[PDB]
């Protein structure tokens, strides 16, 4: 695993990792955090039916 980071990185609001290759991401329209689709359990197909995504934290 690489040491250090990319200063121009986006971190998943759930797992806290960087973006990798061929990953599906989704953004909360309220807090504007990004999430691995795998981490919030949303597929591209499902996300197609989502008008405005609201993350678990904002949904409380």
């Amino acid at each position: 695993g690489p040491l250090g980071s990319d200063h121009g990185e986006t971190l998943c609001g759930a797992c806290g990792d960087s973006d990798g290759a061929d990953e599906f991401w989704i953004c909360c329209d309220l807090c504007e955090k990004w999430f691995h689709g795998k981490c919030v359990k949303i597929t591209p197909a499902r996300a197609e039916h989502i008008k405005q995504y609201k993350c678990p934290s904002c949904s409380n």
Binding site: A21, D22, F24, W25, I26, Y53
Partner: peptide, 9 residues
């Protein structure tokens, strides 16, 4: 929703 798919290697 605001989504994105990253590229391959």
């Amino acid at each position: 929703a605001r989504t994105k798919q990253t590229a391959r290697k």
